[PDB]
Amino acid sequence: TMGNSTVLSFCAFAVDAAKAYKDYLASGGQPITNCVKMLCTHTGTGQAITVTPEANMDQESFGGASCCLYCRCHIDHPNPKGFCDLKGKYVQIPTTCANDPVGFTLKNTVCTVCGMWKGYGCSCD
Numbered sequence: 001t002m003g004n005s006t007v008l009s010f011c012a013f014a015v016d017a018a019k020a021y022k023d024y025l026a027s028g029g030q031p032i033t034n035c036v037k038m039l040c041t042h043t044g045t046g047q048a049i050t051v052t053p054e055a056n057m058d059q060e061s062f063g064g065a066s067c068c069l070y071c072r073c074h075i076d077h078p079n080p081k082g083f084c085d086l087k088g089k090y091v092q093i094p095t096t097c098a099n100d101p102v103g104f105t106l107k108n109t110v111c112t113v114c115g116m117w118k119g120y121g122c123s124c125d
């Protein structure tokens with residue numbers, strides 16, 4: 001098992017950190033841990049990213065920044081204003097994927113319409 005600081009270091013100095021984290025996971029690597037899990041009722045909306053925790057019965061809630069590879073790596077966000085969609089918000093992850101929230105937020109996309117994760121509850125189809 002690799003620990004957090006070895007993975008994080010490895011990705012942070014990659015020219016493409018997101019590709020390194022994915023390629024690492026694909027090879028069977030141990031996911032980044034110590035994301036900040038939230039106590040909450042699990043009666044929330046199920047929206048992906050929210051101002052307070054919004055988990056439904058099928059989700060967990062985390063502190064957004066602790067689930068963001070770039071925040072966890074202390075590097076610039078790949079958005080040309082450098083702005084973070086998770087910093088200071090709360091992210092709702094499906095409980096099945098809650099063992100790798102950093103990987104989940106990376107690999108996935110919020111539906112422009114729903115508000116929920118495309119492919120994971122987004123009902124729109």
Ligand SMILES: [Zn+2]
Binds near residue numbers: 068069071084085087
């Ligand atoms: Zn971030």
Ligand SMILES: [Zn+2]
Binds near residue numbers: 112115116123124
């Ligand atoms: Zn949708």
